[PDB]
């Protein structure tokens, strides 16, 4: 039950147009902040801090600035809905199951999008993976045990408060962090859905003093610029193939999460030769149905 009411609210607002016809969950959303006061903390086994909730709360002070809060959870690929995100999706699972690209799978009990059965099902089945128990944890596994997730991800690449940094992408500016070495292999960080690159805050550490770690905030997320857009994934694909593409970035890690697993995915099954390893949690992968 309480497992269910955090898909519940998460899907709030979809659930309200769809089967109870209402638009009551987005006014849930838009106008109580609900993804950010509800959903995020129900994300996370360990209470966060009013330092902490302050700095997820600060891209979305205002209501007008909450429309990809809203929008994410109407892309899931639940019960064959959006079509072509489901397609979106499937397409990319299968590239990832024929792939022998590094790949390296953080879970939690009893997890959010990934149920423990899940990422040990899909561990055994992908090439080159490797599954680390992160022990309790939801949906923000970073936010739960993120020195184990920055220990092994260090070990893992071996194997193979910062300053902000910004680059015009599409008309639009985006933040993004930028630490470690300038040459190598550099290590891409994608958030999800509702952080910013202040999820990988204690991950990063872990990482820097031998490869670069770069973590951009999403479109309309975190420090980047908000335009009026739907915010659809089609927007955040674009946005973010054009900011890889500033940066100058040939091969690449990536280090993916929620719907930044999505982008990292997508992005990695139409550019597979420049993919060099995938570490991933908590990710997106097609739902049969709502049961
Ligand atoms: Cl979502």
Not at 13 to 24: A, I, K, N, P, T
Not at 166 to 183: A, I, N, S, T
Not at 249 to 272: C, M, Q, T, Y
């Amino acid at each position: 039950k309480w497992n269910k009411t955090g898909h519940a609210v998460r899907a709030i607002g979809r659930l309200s147009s769809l089967e109870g016809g209402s638009d009551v969950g987005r006014k849930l959303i838009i106008d109580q902040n609900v993804f950010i006061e509800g959903t995020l903390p129900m994300g996370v086994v360990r209470p966060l801090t009013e330092v902490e909730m302050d700095h997820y709360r600060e891209p979305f002070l205002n209501p007008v600035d909450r429309e990809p809060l809203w929008r994410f959870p109407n892309e899931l690929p639940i019960a064959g809905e959006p079509a072509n995100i489901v397609a979106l999706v499937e397409e990319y699972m299968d590239w990832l199951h024929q792939s022998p690209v590094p790949k390296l799978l953080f879970w939690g009990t009893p997890g959010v999008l990934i149920p423990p059965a899940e990422a040990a099902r899909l561990a055994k089945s992908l090439p080159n993976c490797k599954a680390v128990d992160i022990g309790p944890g939801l949906n923000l596994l970073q936010e739960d045990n993120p020195d184990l997730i920055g220990s092994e991800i260090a070990r893992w690449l071996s194997t193979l408060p910062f300053d902000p940094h910004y680059v015009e992408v599409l008309g639009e500016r985006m933040h993004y962090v930028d630490v470690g070495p300038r040459d190598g292999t550099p290590v891409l960080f994608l958030h999800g859905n509702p952080t910013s690159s202040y999820v990988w805050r204690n991950i990063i550490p872990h990482v820097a003093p031998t490869h670069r770690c770069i973590a951009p905030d999403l479109i309309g997320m975190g420090k980047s610029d908000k335009p009026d857009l739907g915010y659809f994934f089609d927007d955040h694909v674009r946005f973010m193939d054009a900011f890889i593409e500033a940066l100058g970035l040939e091969e690449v890690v990536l280090v993916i999460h929620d719907w930044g697993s999505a982008l990292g995915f997508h992005w990695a099954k139409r550019n597979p030769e420049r993919v060099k390893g995938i570490a991933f949690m908590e990710f997106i992968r097609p739902i049969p149905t709502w049961d």
